[PDB]
Amino acid sequence: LGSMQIFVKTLTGKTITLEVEPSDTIENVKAKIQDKEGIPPDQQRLIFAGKQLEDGRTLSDYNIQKESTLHLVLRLRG
Amino acid sequence: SNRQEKLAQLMRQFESGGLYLRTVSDHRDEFENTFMPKLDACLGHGCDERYWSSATFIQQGLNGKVHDPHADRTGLIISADARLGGFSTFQYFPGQFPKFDMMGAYQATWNEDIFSVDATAVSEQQMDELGIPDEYRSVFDFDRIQEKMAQPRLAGREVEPTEAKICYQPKDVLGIYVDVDSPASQSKARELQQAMREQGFDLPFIAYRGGAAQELASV
C-alpha cells in the first residue's frame, strides 16, 4: 500500500522481481534483496537513473514508479 | 512543403549529415496526442517546446538498427533541424538526460568512484577525473552525434538503436517510416500518412534499413 512491482538486474544478467511500495526506504528494499539473494544491505549498491540510492531516503524520494528497473552492484562494505 | 519538397530535403539530409527516425508503437496516439497538439500551437500563438520524443540517428552508410522489438512499428522521419536535448549510443524535458552511462561506464572501468556522482549532474572535469571513456558519454549538439557515429559508419559495422531526445515541430516531419518485411508496419504507416496528408502534410513513405533509404508510392 501502495504495493508495486520493480525489477533489479545484477551484473551477471540475472533479473530479480520485488513487490515494493513507494514508502519503502532504500534500507527496506535492500532487506528484501537480502532475503532473495543473500546479500547483506551493507554490501549493496542500488543504481537508478544514473545515481546510487542512499539509505534513509525512500522510494518516492527518487521518483521510482511501477516496473522501473534498478541495478544491483555489490560492494565490500559501507 | 509538398511531398516532393520534403523528400528532397529528406534525401539531402540523409546523404549528408543525417537526421532522426522516431518509431511509434501507436501511430494514433502519436498523431492525436503529440503531432496535433504541436500543430494547434503552431497555427495559434506559436510553436512551443512542450513535447519531447525519443528518436534514433540515421545517416547514409550508417548500418544502424531502429527500435522495433516486434518488427511492427511505423514512424516519422524527422529533419535534422529539430531541437536536440541529448544523444546516447545506449514525461521528459531537457535536464533529465544522463551525461554518461553509469552502468556501462562501470563495467568498462570498474571504478567504484563512479557511484559518488550524479550522472545527470556531473561536470566535464569530474567525468575526466573519473576516467569515463568517450563511448559512454552523452553528447548535446548535432555535430557531436555525427562524430560519435563516424567510426561505425565508415567501418560499416552494424550498430544498435541509439536514442536522442528531440522536440520536433510539424515543419520537421519529412516522411513516414515503413518496415518492408512487416504487414503490420505497412498498415499503420498507411493510416498515419493519410491522417497527416489530411492535415496538410503530404509525406513520402520511407523504407529505411542498413544505412539505406528509399521512397515508396503507397504501402
Q: What DSSP string runs through chain B?
A: --HHHHHHHHHHHHTTT-EEEEEES-HHHHIIIIIHHHHHHHHTT-------EEEEEE-TT--B--S-TTS--EEEEE-TTSEEEEEE-----TT-S-SB-HHHHHHHH--GGGGGS-TTS--HHHHHHHT--GGGB-B-SHHHHHHHHHHHHHHT--BPPPEEEEE--GGGEEEEE--TT-HHHHHHHHHHHHHHHTTT----EEEEETTEEEEES--
- Chain A residues whose beta carbon lies within 8 Å of the beta carbon of residue B127: none
Question: In whole angstroms, what is the distance from residue A13 CA to residue B34 CA?
Answer: 35
Cα-based torsion angle of the residue sequence B65, B69, B70, B71 in order, rounded to the nearest 10 degrees? -10
Cα B160 to chain centroid, rounded: 13
Minimal CA separation from A28 to chain B, in Å: 20
Q: Evaluate the omega torsion of the peptide bond into residue A2 and state whether it is cis, within 30 degrees of 0.
A: yes
Which set of grid coordinates corresponds to residue B50?
Answer: 512542450
The residue extents of the domains of chain A are 3-78
| Beta carbons of B69 and B160 less than 8 angstroms apart | no
Phi, psi of B49 (to 5 degrees): -110, 55
Cα A15 to chain centroid, rounded: 12
Task: Give the chain B residue nearest A72 (alpha carbons).
Answer: B103
Q: How is domain A3-78 classified at the architecture level of CATH?
A: Roll (3.10)
Provide the resolution (angstroms): 2.2
Whether residues A47 and B115 touch (CB distance < 8 A) is answered with yes
- As beta bridge partners, residue B21 has B56, B77
- Chain A residues whose beta carbon lies within 8 Å of the beta carbon of residue B120: 49-51
Give, as one character, the DSSP assignment of residue A12.
Answer: T
Whether residues B115 and A71 touch (CB distance < 8 A) is answered with no
- As beta bridge partners, residue A52 has A47
Contacts of B1 (CB under 8 A, 6+ apart): B9
